[PDB]
Design an enzyme around this catalytic site. Structure first.
Site, PDB file in Angstrom:
ATOM      1  N   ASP A  43      12.742  41.400  87.499  1.00 26.03           N
ATOM      2  CA  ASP A  43      12.591  40.729  88.026  1.00 26.03           C
ATOM      3  C   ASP A  43      10.770  39.612  87.911  1.00 26.03           C
ATOM      4  O   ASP A  43      10.544  40.497  87.593  1.00 26.03           O
ATOM      5  CB  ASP A  43      12.946  40.756  89.327  1.00 26.03           C
ATOM      6  CG  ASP A  43      11.786  41.248  90.225  1.00 26.03           C
ATOM      7  OD1 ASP A  43      12.614  41.266  91.373  1.00 26.03           O
ATOM      8  OD2 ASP A  43      11.276  41.481  90.367  1.00 26.03           O
ATOM      9  N   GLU A  75      18.511  33.104  90.662  1.00 28.90           N
ATOM     10  CA  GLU A  75      19.333  34.513  91.034  1.00 28.90           C
ATOM     11  C   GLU A  75      19.613  34.603  88.855  1.00 28.90           C
ATOM     12  O   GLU A  75      19.489  35.458  88.358  1.00 28.90           O
ATOM     13  CB  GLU A  75      19.753  35.297  91.309  1.00 28.90           C
ATOM     14  CG  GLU A  75      18.756  35.235  92.695  1.00 28.90           C
ATOM     15  CD  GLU A  75      17.993  36.054  92.340  1.00 28.90           C
ATOM     16  OE1 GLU A  75      17.151  35.479  93.773  1.00 28.90           O
ATOM     17  OE2 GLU A  75      17.682  36.300  91.647  1.00 28.90           O
TER      18      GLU A  75
END
Ligand SMILES: [Cl-]
Ligand SMILES: [Cl-]
Length: 162
Positions: free
Chosen positions: A20, A11
């Site tokens: 993202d 992440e």
């Protein structure tokens, strides 16, 4: 290696709201803020999440705080999902980290939908599972991370993370 170090690698860590891989407003260690195309909506979710007006920016401690809540949320999710629980319970600690990872990334319902892979995993047919897991939008959209997670399920070792 453990679930936290694993997701921290997949992440990343960014203290300013960013988009993202799916183009959704995110902050810290993969803490999705909202699926809304509105940055202000994101900012509202952020301040609500942190408990203060962050103006789109947070600290490292704050990022890790949201991270632990999220990791925990993913596990509790698995534990309460009729389809995920039996698999999770059937796996050794390394492999289940691969399951938490998926859930953290695509949500409980999403993973719960991998009927076929889940069964192969439960059956402990590792290579077969790994092949089935890859025939997915997930693998095609985030192939490198999916390869790590899949290698984890396949071997039950942390090789893909070292
Ligand atoms: Cl496919
Ligand atoms: Cl990737």
């Amino acid at each position: 290696m453990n679930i936290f170090e694993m997701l921290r690698i997949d992440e990343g860590l960014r203290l300013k709201i960013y988009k993202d891989t799916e183009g959704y407003y995110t902050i810290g260690i993969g803490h999705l803020l909202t699926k809304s195309p509105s940055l202000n909506a994101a900012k509202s979710e952020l301040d609500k999440a942190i408990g203060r007006n962050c103006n789109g920016v947070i600290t490292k401690d704050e990022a890790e705080k949201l991270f632990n809540q999220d990791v925990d949320a993913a596990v509790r999710g698995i534990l309460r999902n009729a389809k995920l629980k039996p698999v999770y319970d059937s796996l050794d600690a390394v492999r289940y980290c691969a399951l938490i990872n998926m859930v953290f990334q695509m949500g409980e319902t999403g993973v719960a939908g991998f009927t076929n892979s889940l069964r192969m995993l439960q059956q402990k047919r590792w290579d077969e599972a790994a092949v089935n897991l890859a025939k997915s939008r997930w693998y095609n959209q985030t192939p490198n991370r999916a390869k790590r997670v899949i290698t984890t399920f396949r071997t039950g070792t942390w090789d893909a993370y070292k």
